A = this chain, B = another copy of it.
Amino acid sequence: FLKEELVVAVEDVRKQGDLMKSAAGEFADDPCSSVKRGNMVRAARALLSAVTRLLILADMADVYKLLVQLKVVEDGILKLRNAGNEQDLGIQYKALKPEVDKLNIMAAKRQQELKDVGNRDQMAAARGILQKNVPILYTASQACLQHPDVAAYKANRDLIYKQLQQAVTGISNAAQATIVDPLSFSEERFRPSLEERLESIISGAALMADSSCTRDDRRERIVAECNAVRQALQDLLSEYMGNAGRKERSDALNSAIDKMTKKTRDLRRQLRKAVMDHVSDSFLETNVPLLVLIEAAKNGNEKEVKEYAQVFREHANKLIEVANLACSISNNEEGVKLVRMSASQLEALCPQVINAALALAAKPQSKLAQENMDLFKEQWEKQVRVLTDAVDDITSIDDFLAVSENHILEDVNKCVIALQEKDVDGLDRTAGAIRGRAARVIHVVTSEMDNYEPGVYTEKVLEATKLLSNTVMPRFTEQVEAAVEALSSDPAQPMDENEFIDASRLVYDGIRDIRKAVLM
């Protein structure tokens, strides 16, 4: 198998190589010779075969190598979880750290070798989870030995083990392996025949919408633009059916499709201007399911914690979905991998967050718990911001600023009208959304400017950003709360409508002068 095949391969490669050299030579001395030429050709082909045979054999060498190390790490992981005393536990992790690393290398190898990108993604995703959890399993399984009466800890340890076991299998599964979608799909229509097989590849493969999980506007917009392009496709399939044979150029009918089909591809640009906006219709409030999910457990409340798991979990994955929708549309693979990977890790760091809350809700005094939470908290936010920053790039920074401009405008007035309606519950709420999108805008603008060389362009932009967050925003928040303390205190002190409006306007305008500075 191993060495066996190798020597054998070296042979074929050696022999064919010699015959190729001579042939190549005889051709060099007589390049204007047709025969001597053909000889060189056949020779080249023969060389290819010998060379490839070695590559294939070489692939086995790598695969096998991956297997050996894979099985080693498998047992090691289970041995770590089953550790009973801190002595054995510490001993296992040390003998596993290297084994894990080695496998990590070998994994990256097959990852590249795997042809179809799909499997390649699985390999990297599996490798990641494996790489991240291995250390965590140690910390989890360790806690169970210090507090054997904390089912919460045991449950966590096992969940990590589960994910780890998954990764290992995923590596082997992908090791046996051997893009956008609307882009490549739209490029298919041009022939004087078979209108029956094209009508099926353009019909049954052009019916995949999505929508949902967005605000009412995004649903409406998507509904209108999706119907306008569906009709478009049918105008292309009903008008095209009249070309026949000789119409192999561009007349009134063939172009009746070329003007409808070639232009209506807009649906794509519609779903984008419809998704990228989620970033401000349910984002910045990223801490919302953590800075309370923790406070619950941190207060010895085992009840409002169980119910919060779903609440937390819900807002989380919902965010990842939109991140995926951003992947469906984006021929950018390098960036899709980033997003899809950042999503996987963050998708795997989910159960851990819950386990933490569980162990803390039962022991809001256990310094080990309060620290375990604090630690997990840090890792969750850290993994969130990245997935977020990874996505902010999968899209157009500029487009983001555009949608943020309109939406900001909407919520801004929602507050202004709330100030008039003297509805604090709304005044507060709306104001918050304003602070959200605003900051979400300053972060994306700045994080995107790190790819540009400092200068007039970067200066005029950051300044516009500095103002909105340093001068603007504060004066507005100062007015929001100022209004609140004018109806909940005593009967109801008179609110200064003026300053509130002008202050709030600065917010919107601020975004405007930043967007304008971004373009320039």
**A interface residues (Cβ-Cβ under 8 A, vs B):** 3, 6-7, 10, 13-14, 17, 20-21, 24, 27-28, 31-32, 37, 40-41, 44-45, 47-48, 51-52, 54-55, 58, 61, 179, 181, 184-185, 194, 196-197, 200-201, 203-205, 207, 209, 328, 340
Assuming the contacts A21-B14, A24-B10, asked whether A55 and B51 have C-beta atoms less than 8 A apart, the reply is no
Q: Are B207 and A201 in contact (CB under 8 A)?
A: yes
Q: Which residues of B contact A3 (CB under 8 A)?
A: 31-32
Q: Given contacts A6-B31, A44-B54, list 7 more A-B pairs with CB under 8 A.
A: A7-B28, A7-B31, A17-B21, A44-B51, A179-B197, A194-B340, A196-B328
Determine which residue in A21, A197, A203 has the highest number of CB atoms from chain B within 10 A of its CB, and name it: A197
Query: Quick one: which of B55, B197, B328 contacts A209, CB cutoff 8 A?
Result: B197
22 A–B contact pairs at CB < 8 A? A3-B32, A6-B27, A6-B31, A6-B40, A13-B24, A14-B21, A14-B24, A17-B21, A17-B47, A37-B61, A41-B61, A44-B58, A45-B55, A48-B48, A48-B55, A51-B51, A179-B197, A179-B200, A179-B201, A181-B200, A201-B207, A204-B205
Report the separation of the CA atoms of residues A421 and B42 in the bound assembly, to the nearest whole angstrom.
75
Q: Which residues of B contact A48 (CB under 8 A)?
A: 48, 51-52, 55
Assuming the contacts A17-B17, A17-B20, A204-B184, asked whether A28 and B45 have C-beta atoms less than 8 A apart, the reply is no
Assuming the contacts A55-B45, A204-B185, asked whether A13 and B7 have C-beta atoms less than 8 A apart, the reply is no
Across the interface, name the chain B residue whose C-beta is closest to A340: B194
Shortest beta-carbon distance from A408 to chain B in Å: 32
Report the separation of the CA atoms of residues A44 and B54 in the bound assembly, to the nearest whole angstrom.
7
Assuming the contacts A20-B13, A21-B14, A24-B13, asked whether A6 and B55 have C-beta atoms less than 8 A apart, the reply is no
Across the interface, name the chain B residue whose C-beta is closest to A21: B17
Across the interface, name the chain B residue whose C-beta is closest to A336: B197
Report the separation of the CA atoms of residues A54 and B37 in the bound assembly, to the nearest whole angstrom.
12
Q: Are A10 and B184 in contact (CB under 8 A)?
A: no
Across the interface, name the chain B residue whose C-beta is closest to A200: B181
Shortest beta-carbon distance from A324 to chain B in Å: 8
Q: Are A6 and B201 in contact (CB under 8 A)?
A: no
Shortest beta-carbon distance from A189 to chain B in Å: 14
Assuming the contacts A185-B204, A200-B181, asked whether A41 and B21 have C-beta atoms less than 8 A apart, the reply is no
Shortest beta-carbon distance from A285 to chain B in Å: 26
Shortest beta-carbon distance from A373 to chain B in Å: 27
Report the separation of the CA atoms of residues A204 and B54 in the bound assembly, to the nearest whole angstrom.
43
Across the interface, name the chain B residue whose C-beta is closest to A324: B196
Across the interface, name the chain B residue whose C-beta is closest to A185: B204
Report the separation of the CA atoms of residues A197 and B328 in the bound assembly, to the nearest whole angstrom.
9
Across the interface, name the chain B residue whose C-beta is closest to A3: B31
Across the interface, name the chain B residue whose C-beta is closest to A46: B51
Report the separation of the CA atoms of residues A80 and B340 in the bound assembly, to the nearest whole angstrom.
63
Shortest beta-carbon distance from A292 to chain B in Å: 28
Report the separation of the CA atoms of residues A515 and B21 in the bound assembly, to the nearest whole angstrom.
61
Report the separation of the CA atoms of residues A40 and B58 in the bound assembly, to the nearest whole angstrom.
10
Shortest beta-carbon distance from A241 to chain B in Å: 15
Q: Are B51 and A47 in contact (CB under 8 A)?
A: yes
Across the interface, name the chain B residue whose C-beta is closest to A40: B10
Q: Are A27 and B10 in contact (CB under 8 A)?
A: yes
Report the separation of the CA atoms of residues A356 and B7 in the bound assembly, to the nearest whole angstrom.
69
Shortest beta-carbon distance from A160 to chain B in Å: 17
Q: Which residues of B contact A196 (CB under 8 A)?
A: 328
Q: Are B13 and A44 in contact (CB under 8 A)?
A: yes
Report the separation of the CA atoms of residues A10 and B29 in the bound assembly, to the nearest whole angstrom.
11
Report the separation of the CA atoms of residues A37 and B64 in the bound assembly, to the nearest whole angstrom.
15
Q: Which residues of B contact A20 (CB under 8 A)?
A: 13, 17
Shortest beta-carbon distance from A175 to chain B in Å: 18
Shortest beta-carbon distance from A155 to chain B in Å: 17
What 8 pairs between A and B have smallest CB-CB spacing?
A: A44-B54, A10-B24, A3-B31, A47-B51, A48-B51, A181-B200, A41-B58, A17-B17
Q: Which residues of B contact A14 (CB under 8 A)?
A: 21, 24
Q: Which residues of B contact A10 (CB under 8 A)?
A: 24, 27-28, 40
